[PDB]
Design a protein around this ligand. Structure first.
Ligand SMILES: [Cl-]
Ligand SMILES: [Cl-]
Ligand SMILES: [Cl-]
Ligand SMILES: [Cl-]
Ligand SMILES: [Cl-]
Ligand SMILES: [Cl-]
Lengths: 242, 242
């Protein structure tokens, strides 16, 4: 069957990723960003009580999915890529955004694009990969013939710190946040090559979820009426770096 | 409540739209195109028995969705836009393609983009709109404030004919097929303006369908292994017009 979310409390998993979900320390934590604004649009229209729960530090995206599958959250909202391995254990809403990935490196590194990685120009152990992300999936399929020979990374912060310190030469990142971070935070990091792994982001729900239709109709309505476009402009259309 | 499709017969509704579903006579009917290739890729991986059924000639896209909801088909595969209104009555698989629309017109027409339709450079009735398509919903929301005052079209053929005859000055068309037709068939028609109504195509299924996960996981696997990209290149790269 099916029902509406009105009056229901949803434990909503979120995961730190600027400017999707921005975590500020205050003297407690305040969450802002595209995700929190999206949650408000949905709450206002649908009438659920939002119980927003930030994932622990260093939680990977597959870890968030596994946590929801284990019953730790009711839904999860974020820059979460829809993948076949994830779809085996959870459902996803209609997509909230297209997505693709780019190659991230320190300025001055001599890499022209993905061919350099596939042709063995970079030592595999100097390609940094955040485990439990779709980038890892792409790496294992396309680069290393299934071997985990990358330099493993536990978070975006470790990725940035490692590139800046010359511990790794390159990594992969979703295009939205990659543009955001290189245009606003790390002016000495840059993106190179064509984008790859065209994909989508979706809200994670339980499989065969009672509330699947209600959520999907609402997301599609936000898409159709331009609310998702507005939110994307609000949070992403900014550049600080010279 | 879930099951695998192996050995199950699926009645698969398809709808004429070159080069997704291409219909040829000789008396018998042959179907080819992206959709038919996709069915074969899915059939090979999933092991269902395909009973492919072409929708009757005058069938609209909304008509196809309603027919499925009525039980006339088990799934429908095509260039079928996922919309909030359709999601009320059917479910959709994970997307097989991104989509957006463009304005179609005769070459030489002095239209810069959507503003000229919104400003009134063109009477509302100089705009041809195919009934029962996502384009109709866009027109009613963004152009006419709900008024059904466009020039009504029953098929793509009526659209092309009416533009070529000076009866309408513009229509709307999904970008993949609009590019194909203006690049290979109607060399004197063209596209203008920014794309609009960013959306997705999905396979139509019943709501709360037993087989949802099996189909979704397989679609995503085709996405990840490059098969969807391959199919798109195969059927859409051509440009016959000088
Ligand atoms: Cl979708
Ligand atoms: Cl990423
Ligand atoms: Cl499911
Ligand atoms: Cl999707
Ligand atoms: Cl169309
Ligand atoms: Cl449903």
């Amino acid at each position: 069957g099916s029902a509406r979310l009105k009056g229901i409390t949803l434990r909503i998993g979120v995961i730190e990723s600027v400017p999707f979900t921005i975590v500020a320390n205050v003297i407690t934590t305040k969450l802002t960003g595209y995700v929190l604004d999206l949650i408000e649009y949905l709450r206002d229209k649908m009438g659920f009580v939002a119980d927003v729960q930030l994932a622990p530090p260093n939680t990977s995206y597959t870890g968030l999915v596994l946590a929801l599958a284990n019953g730790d959250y009711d839904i999860a909202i974020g820059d979460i890529t829809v993948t076949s391995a994830r779809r085996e254990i959870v459902a996803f809403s209609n997509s909230i955004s297209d997505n693709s990935m780019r190659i991230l490196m320190r300025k001055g590194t001599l890499i022209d694009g993905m061919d350099d990685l596939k042709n063995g120009k970079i030592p595999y152990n100097r390609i940094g990969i955040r485990i439990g992300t779709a980038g890892e999936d792409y790496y294992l399929r396309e680069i290393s013939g299934g071997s985990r020979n990358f330099y493993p990374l536990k978070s975006r912060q470790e990725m940035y710190d490692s590139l800046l310190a010359g511990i790794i030469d390159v990594s992969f990142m979703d295009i939205g946040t990659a543009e955001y971070v290189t245009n606003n935070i790390y002016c000495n990091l840059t993106l190179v090559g064509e984008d790859f792994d065209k994909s989508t982001f979706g809200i994670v729900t339980p499989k065969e979820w009672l509330y699947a239709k209600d959520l999907d109709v609402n997301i599609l309505s936000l898409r159709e009426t331009g609310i998702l476009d507005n939110l994307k402009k609000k949070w992403f259309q900014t550049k600080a770096c010279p």
